[PDB]
Amino acid sequence: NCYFPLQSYGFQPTNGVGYQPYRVVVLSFELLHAPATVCGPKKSTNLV
Amino acid sequence: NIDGYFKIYSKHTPINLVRDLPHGFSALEPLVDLPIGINITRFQTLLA
Ligand SMILES: *[C@@H]1O[C@H](CO)[C@@H](O)[C@H](O)[C@H]1NC(C)=O
């Protein structure tokens, strides 16, 4: 009952859908407790 | 440091007159507005 806690994923070109490796990014953000140093693009238009 | 934005205002004035600190009128333009969001209490300065 002594075990090492960590092992490889056996990722091979023959693995099935879902058994394959998938890349993951998770966008968290924390908000409004201080000024919003990020926003997306606001659009612009011709100056008539 | 106000509303979570920090603001540097400044003027450069090449007074060649030797005496200390002039009386006469001029005003600081705003240089920089920064979203730094930090509380503050004191400051220090850097000399060569
Ligand atoms: C700034 O000061 C107040 C009062 O101590 C505190 O409630 C607030 O959480 C502080 N902000 C930060 C970023 O520590």
Deposited resolution, Å = 3.7
Distances (CA, A) of A12 to A15, B3, B36: 6, 54, 47
Report CB contact under 8 Å: A37, B35. Answer: yes
From the CA of A14, how far away is ligand 1's center (Å)? Answer: 55
A-B C-beta contacts closer than 8 Å: 11
Are B1 and B40 within 8 A, CB to CB?
yes
Amino acid letter for position B35: P
Burial of B32: CB neighbours in 10 Å, binned 0-12, 13-18, 19+: exposed
Which residues lie across from B30 on neighbouring strands?
B9
